[PDB]
């Protein structure tokens, strides 16, 4: 489960 | 072209596009310069796996921690693998390659995650027409600053997504152009030579100075 990602 | 990008961003900034008697950036527009490719979705997991991305044609790419890349194509089966020196290979999902089987399953986590949980960027915008069978561009290198994340592709492109105001900046050095996306999500494609002649607003000028600084960082992290 990612720590960071693009606009959700 | 990373060095050519410096020479284009030097001339526009040396003309000071915001400090003009009258700003007319609408006259610098050129819709026929819209890029073919840009990064619509990304996932940072470099603390374990790598950065994964999604291009505007729904293609999904992933850059591993050992500087190796594996791209999945638009049909959902064709796999292209790039090594830690820029060597390319071609294979398929159904005909399973055992040596890469770990990276296929990892790619699938990125691919599922983006289709299910993330929002597509530049969505309404109609992309530029290209060669149907030509190769996809992969991700060369990336880094995160306080204000933006910088994405440098293998076709000469540099994209800079800003964190607070959701704005995006696509730099195309081949035909000298920049594609802007504002917070209200409206797209404009500009010619840099015309952006000198006619000038632009403060936020476009301050982000064209900031982009130049990121280009200098991209030459220095090598």
Residue numbers in the entry:
A (entry chain E): 2 to 9
B (entry chain A): 373 to 594
Paper text:
The PBD domain is responsible for the proper cellular localization of Plk1 through an array of phosphorylation-dependent protein–protein interactions mediated by the phosphopeptide-binding groove.
In addition, the two double-ring aromatic systems 3 j,k were tested, both giving high ΔΔTm values indicative of hydrophobic pocket binding. The structures of these compounds suggest that they are able to insert their benzene rings into the pocket, reinforcing the suggestion of its selectivity for aromatic moieties. Peptides identified in the assay as pocket binders have in general shown higher affinity than those not utilizing the pocket, and all the most potent ligands (3 d, 3 f, 3 j, and 3 k, colored purple) also bind to the pocket exhibiting the highest ΔΔTm>4.0 K. None of the peptides designated as weak binders (in blue) showed pocket binding. In contrast, 3 j bound in a way similar to 1 a, retaining the key hydrogen bond and the benzene ring of thiophene was inserted into the pocket, mimicking the phenylalanine of 1 a.
